[PDB]
Design a protein around this motif. Structure first.
Motif, PDB file in Angstrom:
ATOM      1  N   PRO A   1       0.818  -1.234   0.000  1.00 50.05           N
ATOM      2  CA  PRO A   1       0.000   0.000   0.000  1.00 50.05           C
ATOM      3  C   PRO A   1       0.845   1.274   0.000  1.00 50.05           C
ATOM      4  CG  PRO A   1      -0.998  -1.565   1.447  1.00 50.05           C
ATOM      5  CD  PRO A   1       0.400  -2.108   1.111  1.00 50.05           C
ATOM      6  N   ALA A   2       0.180   2.404  -0.243  1.00 48.74           N
ATOM      7  CA  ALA A   2       0.819   3.718  -0.288  1.00 48.74           C
ATOM      8  C   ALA A   2       0.946   4.349   1.101  1.00 48.74           C
ATOM      9  CB  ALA A   2       0.052   4.623  -1.220  1.00 48.74           C
ATOM     10  N   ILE A  43      -2.851  11.398   3.792  1.00 51.06           N
ATOM     11  CA  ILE A  43      -2.638  10.242   2.920  1.00 51.06           C
ATOM     12  C   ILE A  43      -3.615  10.231   1.720  1.00 51.06           C
ATOM     13  CG2 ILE A  43      -4.108   8.649   4.271  1.00 51.06           C
ATOM     14  CD1 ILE A  43      -1.843   6.474   3.744  1.00 51.06           C
ATOM     15  N   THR A  47      -1.090  10.812  -1.896  1.00 47.72           N
ATOM     16  CA  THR A  47      -0.904   9.557  -2.617  1.00 47.72           C
ATOM     17  C   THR A  47      -1.702   9.575  -3.918  1.00 47.72           C
ATOM     18  OG1 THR A  47      -2.708   8.362  -1.473  1.00 47.72           O
ATOM     19  CG2 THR A  47      -0.505   8.269  -0.488  1.00 47.72           C
ATOM     20  N   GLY A  48      -1.345   8.674  -4.825  1.00 48.45           N
ATOM     21  CA  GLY A  48      -2.020   8.610  -6.104  1.00 48.45           C
ATOM     22  C   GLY A  48      -1.704   7.336  -6.848  1.00 48.45           C
ATOM     23  N   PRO A  49      -2.430   7.061  -7.941  1.00 48.15           N
ATOM     24  CA  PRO A  49      -2.225   5.856  -8.742  1.00 48.15           C
ATOM     25  C   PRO A  49      -0.905   5.802  -9.503  1.00 48.15           C
ATOM     26  CG  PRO A  49      -3.665   7.349  -9.859  1.00 48.15           C
ATOM     27  CD  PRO A  49      -3.545   7.864  -8.482  1.00 48.15           C
ATOM     28  N   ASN A  50      -0.368   4.591  -9.605  1.00 49.55           N
ATOM     29  CA  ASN A  50       0.863   4.320 -10.333  1.00 49.55           C
ATOM     30  C   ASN A  50       0.399   3.432 -11.491  1.00 49.55           C
ATOM     31  OD1 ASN A  50       3.406   2.713 -11.053  1.00 49.55           O
ATOM     32  ND2 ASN A  50       4.213   4.202  -9.578  1.00 49.55           N
ATOM     33  N   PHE A  51       0.710   3.846 -12.719  1.00 51.80           N
ATOM     34  CA  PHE A  51       0.294   3.123 -13.927  1.00 51.80           C
ATOM     35  C   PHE A  51       1.370   2.304 -14.654  1.00 51.80           C
ATOM     36  CE2 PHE A  51      -3.964   4.892 -13.881  1.00 51.80           C
ATOM     37  CZ  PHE A  51      -3.838   6.215 -13.405  1.00 51.80           C
ATOM     38  N   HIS A  53       1.981  -0.925 -14.378  1.00 50.28           N
ATOM     39  CA  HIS A  53       1.448  -2.235 -14.754  1.00 50.28           C
ATOM     40  C   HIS A  53       0.280  -2.222 -15.737  1.00 50.28           C
ATOM     41  CE1 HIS A  53       3.270  -3.258 -10.603  1.00 50.28           C
ATOM     42  NE2 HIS A  53       4.133  -3.629 -11.533  1.00 50.28           N
ATOM     43  N   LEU A  54      -0.051  -1.039 -16.257  1.00 50.60           N
ATOM     44  CA  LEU A  54      -1.135  -0.885 -17.229  1.00 50.60           C
ATOM     45  C   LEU A  54      -0.658  -1.441 -18.578  1.00 50.60           C
ATOM     46  CD1 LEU A  54      -4.062   0.546 -17.415  1.00 50.60           C
ATOM     47  CD2 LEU A  54      -2.814   2.540 -18.249  1.00 50.60           C
TER      48      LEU A  54
ATOM     49  N   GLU B  78      -6.897   1.013   3.261  1.00 54.54           N
ATOM     50  CA  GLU B  78      -5.599   1.137   2.609  1.00 54.54           C
ATOM     51  C   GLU B  78      -5.713   1.541   1.148  1.00 54.54           C
ATOM     52  OE1 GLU B  78      -3.662  -2.583   3.506  1.00 54.54           O
ATOM     53  OE2 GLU B  78      -3.256  -1.950   5.575  1.00 54.54           O
ATOM     54  N   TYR B  79      -4.803   2.414   0.725  1.00 51.98           N
ATOM     55  CA  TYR B  79      -4.758   2.912  -0.646  1.00 51.98           C
ATOM     56  C   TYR B  79      -3.941   2.005  -1.560  1.00 51.98           C
ATOM     57  CZ  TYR B  79      -7.109   7.322   0.568  1.00 51.98           C
ATOM     58  OH  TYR B  79      -8.069   8.237   0.926  1.00 51.98           O
ATOM     59  N   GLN B  80      -4.610   1.423  -2.554  1.00 52.74           N
ATOM     60  CA  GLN B  80      -3.953   0.536  -3.511  1.00 52.74           C
ATOM     61  C   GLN B  80      -3.513   1.334  -4.733  1.00 52.74           C
ATOM     62  OE1 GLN B  80      -3.293  -2.631  -2.399  1.00 52.74           O
ATOM     63  NE2 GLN B  80      -4.505  -2.114  -0.578  1.00 52.74           N
ATOM     64  N   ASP B  81      -2.260   1.789  -4.707  1.00 47.60           N
ATOM     65  CA  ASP B  81      -1.680   2.594  -5.781  1.00 47.60           C
ATOM     66  C   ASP B  81      -1.276   1.875  -7.067  1.00 47.60           C
ATOM     67  OD1 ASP B  81       0.388   1.497  -4.169  1.00 47.60           O
ATOM     68  OD2 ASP B  81       1.750   3.158  -4.594  1.00 47.60           O
ATOM     69  N   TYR B  83      -2.023   0.256  -9.959  1.00 52.50           N
ATOM     70  CA  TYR B  83      -3.152   0.046 -10.866  1.00 52.50           C
ATOM     71  C   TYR B  83      -2.922  -1.123 -11.819  1.00 52.50           C
ATOM     72  CZ  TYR B  83      -7.495   1.366 -13.326  1.00 52.50           C
ATOM     73  OH  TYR B  83      -8.767   1.356 -13.845  1.00 52.50           O
ATOM     74  N   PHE B  92      -8.295   3.767  -7.795  1.00 55.21           N
ATOM     75  CA  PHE B  92      -8.539   4.807  -8.786  1.00 55.21           C
ATOM     76  C   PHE B  92      -9.593   4.403  -9.817  1.00 55.21           C
ATOM     77  CE2 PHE B  92      -7.309   7.403 -12.615  1.00 55.21           C
ATOM     78  CZ  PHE B  92      -7.379   8.689 -12.035  1.00 55.21           C
TER      79      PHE B  92
END
Ligand SMILES: [Fe+3]
Ligand SMILES: [Fe+3]
Ligand SMILES: [Fe+3]
Ligand SMILES: [Fe+3]
Lengths: 238, 200, 238, 200, 238, 200, 200
Positions: A1-2, A43, A47-51, A53-54, B78-81, B83, B92
């Motif tokens: 997790p972040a 938090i 925090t934010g999305p990581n792409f 694995h897209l 928990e934040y699942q970053d 994606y 997201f």
């Protein structure tokens, strides 16, 4: 997790355009009259999305081949490249850069666009790229053409490519527009003029890059994106 | 004083934001992997909910070209970053309102509790970012739930809003859409009953 | 028949480009090494063709319709208009103005042009118009795109429309090129740089004309052409 | 001193001058009425001739993309300015050299005598203007005939050229192409045997 | 009947005063909050009334004689003259120019004007003139005096004459105010300051014309009016 | 870019606009020929109507010093530009709201159908220009009729207004005043029910 | 536009270029390891050849102070960048023309075929760089062979030279010096028969 280990430099809302900018007509009814409520960063904001694995397709960044119905698009073949950095000059690696534009004539591939300029059967107008280890991105497309819109009686948007950048957080997330060097329509557009400071308009103008051009093939434009500065947390909760 | 490099100025997402960020909603063909409104898959842990709402301008009219981005924690808080479309839950998601469907929808789970910087627990929330034509720089807001009245009264973020009547705008009303648990969150950009927007 | 009643102002050959301009490579072998021989003006030089009786087609000036294979050309719809005057400011009526260009991508409709940008099946690139009583001309076309050429390793021609103007005589006849306002490729092109004086380069740059633009339809550019001054003969042969 | 409005600067006609000024020669479809190399129709007064030539650069190589414009008087020594494709004779015409045909051709009549500004007769001539890639501003020249030796020696324009060896470059040699009267006029832009170019 | 053959240059609404200018108090409640809706020009907008056949009285343009009750008005005898042209510099002939003003003391001939400066029994304050073939108009009047008004606690209007110009259409129709050269009250007036650009304020200032003055009789002022540029239609509907 | 001569800037008509443009309404003596509210003489062709209305500000209070100018086509859909007081019909007229009469009146005929630039029929309309103190540059609007619902739904100009609720403000309601056909048209400059104003 | 750091400008190699780059040819003592004209050792694979030639100026006079650098592929068409004096073959070499020897010599093998960027085969060539007094910035040329006529007619680089007569200047003529295979390549910097120089 972040985790909550970063803090972002507060946005200068006098540099960025204001919500209420009358000359851009649609902003009158779509702007808050009440003040924005300031909240500390947590938090949820840091925090934010990581792409990483897209599943990116092979031609996702190449607008000359990603629509392809049996040919090449009509228009000025150009490369749009640059770097994504923060306010401290630190590169932003593995971040999502998205883009969309019109064709050579100013026609966009959407049902609501009824502009008389024809659609290009080999051009879609959508692009995505993930920045490398050094924060660099690259797109290959055609230079979009200007188009009119119902604002003033003779308002014309300058040639532009819309950009969407994620960054390390939702706090850094930004949507903007790239303009092309020397376009005489830039000081006339009310969307551009929504930005009060003239030095800020300059940060949106992509410069001609002859060094990154492919001889006898395509020209190139450089567009560097600066996101909110990231720093570590110090002396918090005593 | 110390001046850093200036941040790239914001511009409106435009009326045709859908061609680059919501391909399906734009009536154009989609790519293999897309970022859309399905945050949770049927076998994901937590209480499965459906979120819906309409966006209104200052004249009380529907904003049919709005684009929304959401960021929320899972049921365990928990934040699942990372994606990935193979995951049971993604923190997201993106949704929009079209001319065909002037109402946005989001399929997710009810978020768990997360602490702020000072260790004080925040009430279950969903972070929303609103983009559309006429909106020069995106609007930030939070979605709270009406059945969490006890946690909402103690939330350190919700208590920063001076007037209690303005806190109610951030609260989503519980309802049911097709025998499934749902929450309605309408956004009023301007005027009477204006939604609280944040800056951070 | 035509008569010898006019004299034309002598050309300033330091304003106009020189024959030998090395950076434009092909000019090295195609420029005279011997001086030009000066001769006085006579009926052979002071007279020229009048094209008032030439059979002009309805769409000869309209490049959006004169090729037409069942559609509209892809590119920025523009109007190119202006006035043809002499050095005294006197209008030049009923004169032939001819033009040719590339498509939106920089591809020209000729067999020798092997540039990879595709041809537009609805665009030819040829135009002609006869000036009216006040010396005005007008063309409707698409804005041409830049293209590379084998001169230097990375030389790119700016977006241009080639112009051919007849005038009242063969002494006034001129072929030139129109450039577009703010194009960053203008100070880099060796054909443009063949002209030594910077103030002369400015006379070739067409300016954006928002007043002559058709709202929700097409943009416009203004390009005024100045030909050699015409005066009556005085105190000749005593 | 008195300065007037400056003349619009010249630029090269370019390699593809043919698409706008010689449509047929460019392999593109022609319009109803075109300005080409047929100055005289079979029933026109005067001696019918055929003109041909090749254009050479400084290395002795053929210029296959040259464009030429001609202006000449009729057999009676008069300039017909009113251009019409119905006329038996037109004083104006255009020709070119292509990759297919590196030799230009012109079908016209032998021009009559015309006087200069001072009333002195000039020898029978054809005014030529040369355009091509590499030529920044067009070159002006005159075509004289070899069988008019008596008139050529008295011409006030030809006598302005200081050296007699340079006058010979402006003289077209008489020959025969397919049992028809013809004159050959080769232009050497640069170097050995360079053609005299004028300024007026 | 009138025909649709003309198009008019779009108004620069950043040059003209804005609707909401708070310092001019009455504008707060009398200005639209919603944006103006842009519509294309049609026969309804490009046509307008022609007043050539209106029965003008002999003294309609002469404010020194059109009221007359036994004598001449008290005040500085002046001639207000000028020319009505469009943005292209083309004269606007046979157009209607109407004007109204106060007397030498700032008192207007209306029931609601309760200013303590007396009325002039020989002055009305109304005038009308039809422009000649070359666009010229001329009025003979007395110079108006400044007057106070309930806006701020000590606000004074500069000396002015209100002007109404018809033009070739309802699209050109304009109402404005003329001010006098050197008047120190001009930069202090909130109605004048409704115009943001200081170069626009300059166009409303009448200049002293000693050349058009009648010696031993009256002074003269020059005021040229520029209306929206008129151009013919081109490339419309294809 | 190309810059033309700047247009003379607009200024408010002022509180005493009536002394120069509406002499009778200003209680001042008139001249022989005046431009007023009687567009049609009793014997003019078409359906004779009486138009009336009030002008309101942003606080819902009456504007008792407004000046209005109208421009409409005749019964056949033709614009009569040659203004003369001897004509049965004149396309131009002037009216005002005073302190004695806070309601403006206009005597005219119902306009016929005229086409736009593209040849598409516009619904019967009357072009209005509003001047008053507090209005720096005049407001342009159109008056439509409620009994022409079929043509109003197909008008190209009326269909340019995005929201259907704002189109209703340009529609005048039919009534009867002393056996004469009358239409009421109220103008709301600011606030709730704000009238649509145009730019062209 | 985007401006990078400017490249350090070129200057002439000077008359005494040999004291620093061709020590033996300068009659000065050498160091242990020198870069010279022996690219291939007697036991290297491929066809062993001897290259020789003279350099002429614009007046047809010998340039006795020139310095040349070569770069070629091996017999298999591979570029050996790791320079070492122990290798059987080195892709790089240096030669010069002196006052004692107005002819340069080079001992190497015939290069194999290498492809261009587009995958099209180029004819066997040797890349040459010419330095000397009077030459402000070095001249780039290529050496082709006369016995490879079939590959020379199909080379993408050789076909870029417009005129066929200028392609002949890059072709070295085959001869024999003491039973060894030799090719003669004369460079004419200026004038009649001027060698083609490249820019890249
Ligand atoms: Fe856009
Ligand atoms: Fe060209
Ligand atoms: Fe006043
Ligand atoms: Fe030295």
């Amino acid at each position: 997790p972040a985790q909550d280990n970063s803090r972002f430099v507060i946005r200068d809302r006098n540099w960025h355009p204001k919500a209420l900018t009358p000359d851009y007509k649609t902003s009158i009814a779509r702007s808050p009259r009440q003040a924005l409520v300031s909240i500390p960063q947590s938090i949820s904001e840091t925090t934010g999305p990581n792409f990483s694995h897209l599943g990116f397709g092979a031609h996702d960044h190449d607008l000359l081949l990603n629509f392809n119905n049996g040919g090449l698009p009509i228009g000025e073949r150009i490369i749009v490249a640059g770097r994504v950095v923060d306010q401290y000059g630190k590169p932003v690696p593995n971040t999502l850069v998205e883009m969309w534009q019109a064709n050579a004539g100013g026609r966009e591939r959407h049902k609501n666009d009824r502009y008389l300029a024809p659609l290009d059967p080999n051009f879609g107008g959508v692009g995505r790229c993930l920045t490398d280890s050094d924060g660099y991105y690259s797109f290959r497309t055609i230079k979009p053409g200007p188009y009119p819109w119902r604002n003033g009686p003779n308002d014309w948007r300058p040639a532009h490519i819309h950009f969407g950048i994620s960054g390390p957080s939702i706090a850094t997330k930004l949507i903007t527009q790239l303009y092309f060097e020397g376009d005489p329509l830039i000081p006339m557009c009310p969307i551009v003029k929504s930005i009060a400071n003239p030095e800020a308009v300059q940060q949106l103008i992509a410069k001609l890059d002859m060094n990154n051009a492919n001889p006898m093939d395509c020209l190139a434009y450089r567009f560097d994106i600066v996101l909110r500065g990231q720093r570590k947390t110090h002396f918090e909760n005593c | 004083p110390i001046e850093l490099l200036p941040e790239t100025p914001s511009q409106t997402a435009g009326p045709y934001v859908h061609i680059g960020l919501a391909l399906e909603a734009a009536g154009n063909p989609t790519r293999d992997q897309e970022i859309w409104n399905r945050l949770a898959k049927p076998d994901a842990p937590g209480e499965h909910i459906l979120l819906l709402g309409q966006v209104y301008d200052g004249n009380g009219h529907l904003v049919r070209d709005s684009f929304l981005e959401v960021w929320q924690a899972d049921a365990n808080g928990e934040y699942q970053d990372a994606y990935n479309l193979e995951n049971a839950f993604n923190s997201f998601g993106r949704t929009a309102t079209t001319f065909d469907a002037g109402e946005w929808t989001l399929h997710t789970v009810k978020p768990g509790v997360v602490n702020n910087a000072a260790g004080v627990p925040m009430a279950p929330h969903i972070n929303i970012s609103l983009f559309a034509r006429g909106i020069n720089i995106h609007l930030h807001t939070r979605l709270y739930f009406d059945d969490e009245a006890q946690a909402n009264a103690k939330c350190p973020v919700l208590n920063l809003i001076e007037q209690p009547q303005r806190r109610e705008t951030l609260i989503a009303k519980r309802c049911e859409v097709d025998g499934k648990t749902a929450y309605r969150f309408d956004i009023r950009i301007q005027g009477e009953g204006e939604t609280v927007f944040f800056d951070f």
